[PDB]
Write a protein that binds this ligand. Structure first.
Ligand code: 1SY
Ligand code: 1SY
Ligand code: ZN
Ligand code: ZN
Lengths: 359, 359
DNA sequence: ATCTGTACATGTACAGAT
DNA sequence: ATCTGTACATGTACAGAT
DNA sequence: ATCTGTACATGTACAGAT
DNA sequence: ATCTGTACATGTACAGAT
């Protein structure tokens, strides 16, 4: 039943090969451009993130996410009023003459300006490439990405995401986040929090305050580690261990949402990150690998579904790394929208998911 | 029962404080002296190893192992007669002002010369210490250590072990070693094998060829890791996890052997590394954390005893990292000594462990 | 001036103490 | 059940080197 | 400092086994 | 139907070389 759907969603070796050689050509070229050109982004480094590199991409290999991360030195952060996830970045002491002088304002590092130069460089280099059909997608407000459209023959999107890499303690808003103690352990949590944290040029809204200079926290690196080290036993899904169905529940849920979203404009507010967050919480609630036995795929998916509905009903979905940050606040997502998704999901669930059969 | 014995073997904090303050001073001063002038050992680095840092030291904190390890860049290893564990080290390059030219014995690096110099410097530094009563112990045949004897009132041994560090991949003799795949897993094993490997002086005084140019492999770093990360579950012995009794079993077995060795000179051939190796094999054999439940301390200890007895009776105890290196070979330990230990352990096992009550 | 090796600063798992 | 000393990892300050 | 080489994890594919 | 085992492919870490 769901086995058949997973067979459908499973990427094909040839397709992965073909898509990857092309994306890697383009990304390589861009990345070389960033340092080989005496730019203000010299020293930038590649970190692949997201579904494809987490092995939870479904249907086709047509979306690739990449961070270009730049080690900015000692910076001071300021919480963009009690969101937890948004900040203004100032320099403790401006060492001066540095690459990012012209991105500053009043001791503040403007996300908009820096992103716009990043973008300008990217468009410029993209015009300079002749063996691949590749263009730059129109900018979306509220997006930290510069997105590329490649037509191999087939359509592939690539998000190039500029990120500041900071090596200090994680911000205090994350102190109670990443609650993996009973699941992946305290040693894993402590190690993960010894890793750098990332800031991303996503603008905060209202259109009120310092919208354009605002950055946002990102833990794409931590999420990648988790997705690939997801068991309570060290050998989960390893060649000398036993398979679980955690990844496949993520795939099915992502598929449900993708399908519902294709059909219904009313679901625009919702996204795959909501599903990823919800399953992270579920993996926390039920840490034992035995609670994700492949033979229990259906019930596992069902429990995931019920949890998601609960989140819609209570209108609460806390960011996994930032507890105070409610992804389903009435501010972010309209109540009517959550009732709508609730009803659609309940429909599909109660009728053996007809929408898994269509295209 | 055995729990009361473990209560007796538990180290006291006040003792730990006292011993560690002194040990750390002396080690600190030696490492610093090595790091000075134009000594051959400049660049040497410190790695604390063995029981005390594995948290399996018993009775008193009166023994400390510390590795002074030196990276040796270009390096070629020749195996010593298919023994798996023993090698000659050759620099197939030119000195270029090499600090180790002085120890070169025509293409090869001499263990005994290097050790001799290391030791001479240590002795010299120890003379300049007037705070505490610390002396250098008479050299022991077959020992890669310069041993210090500190009278901190209480007598304390500090083994300063000279080591060569190579960052290349491990020698082929270890390919089928470290069989942790069904226990700690493939990712863990790959990571450990990405770590450097060590070489320490064999320093036998037997009389055989290449006696003073023979080094032995060492993985005390890896062993430390395994001891501190010993569960199939990432949360084993953590604060949101379940305690197991693996280390407690190691403690009991170490204690049985120590008591017997102090009573009977017949057991000089045996050492604690034998029980460490046996228990690593047991942990591979019985990988589930539920096979080391604290409630089953007697059973677990007993199965360990049973296993160990067979090793004596079949004359086989494979080095965990080097399969073909048999620690109980006829050539290392006499059948009489093995029979003697077998009978001692059998007796102990079948009559309440009276030796646990001694002293 | 600027640079950087050394060692202090901070955090927490582990396991003894109370 | 909580409190707490050691070992250990990583971030960062500044003296003395350049 | 930038790059290639090596090893092995993560995947898919598909013929022969259960 | 599912499992197993071999072949096939990419992603990622990091030693070591110029
Ligand atoms: N990845 C991610 N992290 C979030 O915290 C987040 N919050 C909302 N969303 C939305 O989920 C959807 C799917 O994300 P995808 O990864 O496929 O592409 C994302 C991703 O490649 C990148 N991106 C967005 N936020 C971040 C982030 N915090 N860190 C790194 N990359 C990010 O920009 C793309 C678009 O972001 P948005 O147009 O703002 O909204 C996304 C998107 O609609 C998020 N997506
Ligand atoms: N650690 C260790 N690794 C071995 O492969 C080995 N083979 C035999 N032995 C013997 O176990 C006994 C207890 O070891 P301990 O750790 O307390 O002190 C050891 C330890 O501090 C150190 N040492 C010995 N072998 C090594 C080694 N291979 N690597 C690092 N250090 C070592 O020098 C001390 C004396 O060594 P030996 O007199 O050669 O024989 C030892 C010892 O009699 C070994 N011990
Ligand atoms: Zn798994
Ligand atoms: Zn344990």
């Amino acid at each position: 039943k769901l086995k058949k759907v997973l067979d459908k969603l499973r990427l094909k070796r040839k397709d992965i090969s073909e898509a990857a050689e092309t994306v890697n050509k383009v990304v390589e070229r861009l990345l070389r451009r960033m340092q080989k050109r005496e730019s203000e982004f010299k020293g930038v480094e590649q970190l692949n993130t997201g579904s494809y590199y987490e092995h939870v991409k479904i249907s086709a290999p047509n979306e690739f996410d990449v961070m270009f991360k730049l080690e900015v030195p000692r910076i001071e952060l300021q919480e963009y009023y009690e969101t937890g996830a948004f900040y203004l970045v100032k320099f403790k002491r401006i060492p001066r003459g540095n690459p990012l002088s012209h991105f500053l304002e009043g001791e503040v590092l403007s996300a908009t300006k820096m992103l716009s130069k990043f973008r300008k460089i990217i468009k410029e280099e993209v015009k300079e490439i002749k063996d691949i059909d590749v263009s730059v997608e129109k900018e979306k407000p509220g997006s930290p990405a510069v997105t590329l459209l490649i037509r191999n023959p087939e359509e592939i999107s690539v998000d190039i995401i500029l990120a500041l890499e900071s090596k200090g303690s994680w911000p205090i808003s994350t102190k109670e986040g990443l609650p993996i103690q009973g699941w992946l352990g305290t040693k894993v949590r402590t190690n993960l929090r010894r890793e750098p944290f990332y800031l991303v040029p996503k603008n905060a809204k209202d259109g009120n305050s310092f919208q354009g200079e605002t950055w946002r926290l990102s833990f794409s690196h931590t999420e990648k580690y988790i997705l690939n080290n997801h068991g309570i036993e060290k050998t989960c899904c390893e060649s000398s261990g036993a398979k679980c169905c955690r990844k496949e529940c993520l795939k099915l849920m992502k598929y449900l949402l993708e399908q519902l979203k294709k059909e219904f404009q009313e679901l625009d507010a919702f996204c795959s990150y909501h599903v990823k967050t919800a399953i992270f919480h579920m993996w926390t609630q039920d840490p034992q690998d035995s609670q994700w036995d492949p033979r229990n795929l259906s019930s596992c998916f069902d429990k995931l579904l019920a949890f998601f509905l609960e989140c819609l009903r209570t209108e609460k979905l806390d960011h996994y790394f930032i507890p105070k940050f409610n992804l389903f606040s009435q501010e972010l997502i309209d109540r009517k929208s959550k009732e709508f998704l609730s009803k659609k999901i309940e429909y599909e669930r109660n009728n053996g998911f007809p929408i898994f059969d269509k295209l």
